[PDB]
């Protein structure tokens with residue numbers, strides 16, 4: 683896998699963000715995670731978290747996996763990095779997202795994320811409290 687550049691357009695919620703990628707606006711959905719919707723428990727906290735992380739970054743990167751790059755809604759599917767830190771992993775580590783939507787071929791960082799979830803659970807963080 684390799685990192686490519688992108689720039690923030692707008693924070694949307696815990697696991698979606700609008701970025702400019704190869705000069706075009708698109709909504710990215712984060713691979714391998716599920717945050718609660720804004721209207722659910724911890725939804726506002728997950729939104730705040732992603733928002734701070736992407737709005738504070740000097741450098742946003744996108745990393746596609748080996749399979750599907752867009753979903754059926756035309757959302758990009760990627761791992762997203764903020765100054766070299768993976769948003770997907772960080773949400774899970776804090777108990778603000780669950781590992782989810784694991785499909786064959788788009789799962790390079792599965793084990794990394796499950797390891798983070800185990801540690802958030804152990805600490806009873808947020809969703810796990």
Ligand SMILES: Cc1cn([C@H]2C[C@H](OP(=O)(O)O)[C@@H](COP(=O)(O)O)O2)c(=O)[nH]c1=O
Pocket residue numbers: 711712713714715716753754759783785788
């Ligand atoms: C994360 C991810 C979601 N999706 C689709 C499956 C779900 O279909 P349905 O809309 O039919 O439930 C939807 C969940 O995204 P959200 O959690 O953003 O709603 O997005 C993929 O197809 N591939 C993926 O890698």
Ligand SMILES: [Ca+2]
Pocket residue numbers: 697716717718719
């Ligand atoms: Ca969601």
